[PDB]
Amino acid sequence: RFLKVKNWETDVVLTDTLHLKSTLETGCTEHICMGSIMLPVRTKDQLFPLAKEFLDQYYSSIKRFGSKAHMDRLEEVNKEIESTSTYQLKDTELIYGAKHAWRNASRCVGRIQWSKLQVFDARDCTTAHGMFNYICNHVKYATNKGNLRSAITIFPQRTDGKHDFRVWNSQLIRYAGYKQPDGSTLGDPANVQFTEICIQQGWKAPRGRFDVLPLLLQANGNDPELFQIPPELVLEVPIRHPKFDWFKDLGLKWYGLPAVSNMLLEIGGLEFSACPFSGWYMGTEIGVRNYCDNSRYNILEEVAKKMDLDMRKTSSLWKDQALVEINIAVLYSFQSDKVTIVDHHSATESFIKHMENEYRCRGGCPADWVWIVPPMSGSITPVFHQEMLNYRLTPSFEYQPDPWNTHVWKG
Amino acid sequence: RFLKVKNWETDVVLTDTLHLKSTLETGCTEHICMGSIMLPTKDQLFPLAKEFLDQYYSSIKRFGSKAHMDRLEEVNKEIESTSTYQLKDTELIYGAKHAWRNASRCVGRIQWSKLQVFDARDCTTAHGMFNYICNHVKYATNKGNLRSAITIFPQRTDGKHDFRVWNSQLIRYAGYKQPDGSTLGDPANVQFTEICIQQGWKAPRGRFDVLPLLLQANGNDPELFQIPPELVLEVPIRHPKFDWFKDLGLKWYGLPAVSNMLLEIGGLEFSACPFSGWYMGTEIGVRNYCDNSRYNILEEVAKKMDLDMRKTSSLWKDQALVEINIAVLYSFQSDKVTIVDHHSATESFIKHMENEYRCRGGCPADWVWIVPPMSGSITPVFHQEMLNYRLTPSFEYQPDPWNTHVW
Ligand code: HEM
Ligand code: HEM
Ligand SMILES: Cc1cc(N)nc(CCc2cncc(N3CCN(C)CC3)c2)c1
Ligand SMILES: Cc1cc(N)nc(CCc2cncc(N3CCN(C)CC3)c2)c1
Ligand SMILES: C[C@H](O)[C@H](O)[C@H]1CNc2nc(N)[nH]c(=O)c2N1
Ligand SMILES: C[C@H](O)[C@H](O)[C@H]1CNc2nc(N)[nH]c(=O)c2N1
């Protein structure tokens, strides 16, 4: 089958053939689209076809499909599976896997960079202390004094689901949130639940507005242990505005390194439940979402006051005006401090080029329009006018439940 | 089978029981979502009529009543006999309001029950259509206090006697492909403008020429008519702060009136059913003015603001975009023409959505279209999960008449 996508700004039409290699489900049906829904221990039975599907793809990619090496590897994996009920990936396969999981991430606008990913193999890790060390090394490497480098660290795969490695933090670096008895929130409201756990686990909270959370690290299905990332490894950027001098006095800063740590990495049917990965920020993540979401730092009001906008009626677009200025300040600050960041105009333009390239050389590029379009100024970016097809390819990054909801406590 | 939608800003969860009454298809499959794609006989007819009559009689609390059965019978006899059937005035109005109610891409549906329906099924000629359309324009415009309206022309018979409004909106500005290679007026309307010229229109080759109506009656050849200028309410665009903004020479019309869709009710097809409400400000200032393939004025405005247009990271585009939309809202409000900003409108949609879930079991919604084209995440709709599905009565897309016209 052929599927066409049109860009309504340029009339450029592209033809998808890659969707035929789609596997997993979308959530949608012929009667309902679930396009805007955030979120819609394996047998050897299901395991070898998934292993084989993956190895066929790997060996095609290296132009060795049907080779003796290809055939031997299949044979080798088949037996390891029937002997031991699972199998081990070669380093090459692991690196290929992780790069492709990112390449396949339909919600990621930054995918033009997918082939440049530093893969850290942490499959020899056995304890939370070992995890802490690997994660420190990842943070130092990825930060690179502000010249950020994409990286992923891969801890041992799931076995029986009873010995999972998990990073309990949703991101490696994030600020605490503290709910006050008066109902107000100190710090990042997003992180109140996790902060409470940390405190419960023994963390001494400074109770400031921008406290870097400790790492809560779980190895081999044991109870998680707390660790503090050395502060010297945590690069932060004081936020100021190039024209408004009062902006610095808001007392805002943000960390440089966005590093997702709660997702599951699936490769050839194997499940890596601890796989922190990091790139660099697109400005709107901080300036639009982190600062201006009503459920986050929520600073539109205070910024708007200081700008003396007309705040009596929404039709003054005071919220819109303040939002822009804040996003200007975020970009200005990172650039001024030589910390890697990308504006939404740049990142969406690059994505369109990436996407067209992927259609030509790959037969498609699965993309989630809902996530790809930036949270401000949507239609003045080229992705808004771009039809996209969303489908699931493996290897992939998947959501998994939060560990505190599933963990069987040892005590 | 019962579905939940969550609002990630408020944690409010709603349960959709209404999608189970959807019949038409989304374009999506288990393997591929097409949520962002813009365009995804007597035996056929009676169950469609029945489905509709059933929901109609349910609405007036007379389900399984004698009148219900009688009507069902009557319509059945009539299809058996005539191969179609005619809607009672009450059913036409109910159906039109519900077509709007079911429009999953429409953010303004909180107004759905307050829609003035003009029955033009007695129309036979294009001159008759022109008269009805002028009356609609005048009624809906109402000196600037806009009132939603729809005018419904005769239903399709054999597809060779179609009534069609060839225009996409009752009121739009012409577009001309220049020898300078650029484009004068609205680039969106080049093709239509040419057809107007090929059909006789004398273009005043300006930048904001209100297009003539091109009207097709009973499947016959389409005719040109010019809307009385005094019925077309336009608004000069000025900025409350920037004195220079007026020099751009920008204006827009007050009445958004979609004229190219198909109204399906009880299996019957109304190929000519122009409808109108009032603008949300972003439709003009974000899309009509700042879209690259439209008036595309971002650069001119940014220059007049003397912004650093060297690097994209200065967000000069974003700044001009906000100001432009400020001016649009300011101009309309200053001239007392009804308009709604994207904050007010989305806030209304959330309340409508909650009303609908509570009193109907759901509200089909297309997030890709409901979220405004600027400042998306600072509006409540961004954080709102929506389920998209197709209910009837409905407004459907249909082919442009000129690809299908047997001249
Ligand atoms: C290089 C710079 C990168 C940029 C600028 C970038 C940008 C983004 C943005 C803006 C999002 C949407 C999340 C949100 O806005 O809330 C996203 C999502 C995502 N990114 Fe990237 N990204 C980058 C690197 C990476 C890397 C290295 C990986 C993995 C190896 C990755 C994998 C993903 C995945 C799996 C999602 C989906 C998250 C979810 O489903 O919640 N990205 N990215
Ligand atoms: C009264 C105030 C109204 C407002 C503020 C409003 C707002 C909107 C907006 C912003 C859109 C997105 C379309 C675009 O951006 O091009 C839309 C779509 C739509 N509206 Fe409403 N509208 C109103 C009245 C109506 C009425 C009276 C009807 C029908 C009786 C209607 C039917 C539709 C339909 C069918 C669509 C989808 C059109 C398409 O798919 O191209 N609207 N509306
Ligand atoms: C590697 C990377 C780079 C970047 N610029 N942004 C991101 C996404 C940031 C992000 C922020 N908040 C939330 C999420 N997701 C992650 C997955 N999590 C389970 C849900 C929320 C992701 C990731
Ligand atoms: C009644 C009404 C009110 C309003 N504020 N906006 C609209 C939609 C405006 C609009 C602009 N451009 C295009 C479309 N649609 C019309 C149907 N057309 C076939 C596709 C594009 C609609 C309609
Ligand atoms: C309900 C809706 O899907 C939800 O708010 C989505 C919308 N698009 C998004 N896009 C990005 N990049 N990140 C997000 O968290 C979301 N949230
Ligand atoms: C490709 C994409 O679906 C297309 O640009 C859509 C996106 N959302 C939209 N939303 C509205 N309200 N109006 C539009 O024209 C569009 N265009």
Ligand SMILES: [Zn+2]
């Ligand atoms: Zn879908």
